[PDB]
Amino acid sequence: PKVMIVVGGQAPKAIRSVECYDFEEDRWDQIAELPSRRCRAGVVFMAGHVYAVGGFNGSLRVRTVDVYDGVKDQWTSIASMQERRSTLGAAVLNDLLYAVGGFDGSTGLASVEAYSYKTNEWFFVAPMNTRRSSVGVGVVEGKLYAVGGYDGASRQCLSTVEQYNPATNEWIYVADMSTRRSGAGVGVLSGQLYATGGHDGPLVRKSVEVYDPGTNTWKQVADMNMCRRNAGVCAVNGLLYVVGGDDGSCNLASVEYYNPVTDKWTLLPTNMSTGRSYAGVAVIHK
């Protein structure tokens, strides 16, 4: 029995709240709060635990990293990143946790660092070709992808996409998306890389496109029910869940999921108790 964990976010300020959606029971519940208020953090499930990385505490961007113990319902602090990163991407590749880009409060970041839970250490790997804050990431077939985001050097929301291979320690550009997406909800389902929503300046998107690494091709799929940027994304049981987010003004309480076989987006029948954006999301066993 799996549950979906939703970690921090804006509602409308940074919060400590960590919620759990129980799929079988169709119910939201609070679990252990973060040690401090957090939004814009990266969240991943790695080697049996949920990790929460970086973010924003309402005043400063942070380099803190916490791990969640579901048995004791307890968050613990582990090694902090080298850089403060907020609106970063976080992903797991070969059992390393990668912290990709983000914003440190002064500048957007092209730098990338990786965490080993065996040694409890962070180290830099190769930087991206473009600095990217509000960057979505996904891992497919041994590669790490950085999708869209915002480049403060050019002041552009990005349609470009880069691919990282740990074996070469190199980032390369792959096919551009059809559309610029900062704050896209990015995830991987059945070997395909999804870019959902996001924005280009004041224009928020409900459109969705999907990337096949085998063909280096993006294709459009069905629109979401709602315009969303800064939504959390996770994949479970053949479906892509998109959680909360905002439309630039309101934070959304709803969740919707994509079935790639039927090409349909469906709203979760029970909203969160309050709108929440820039929340990270993971799926775990109950």
Binding site: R40, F56, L60, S86, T87, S133, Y150, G183, H199, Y278
Partner: peptide, 9 residues
């Protein structure tokens, strides 16, 4: 520093 995400500044 501005509290907004970079893309919104």
């Amino acid at each position: 520093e501005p509290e907004e995400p970079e893309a919104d500044q």
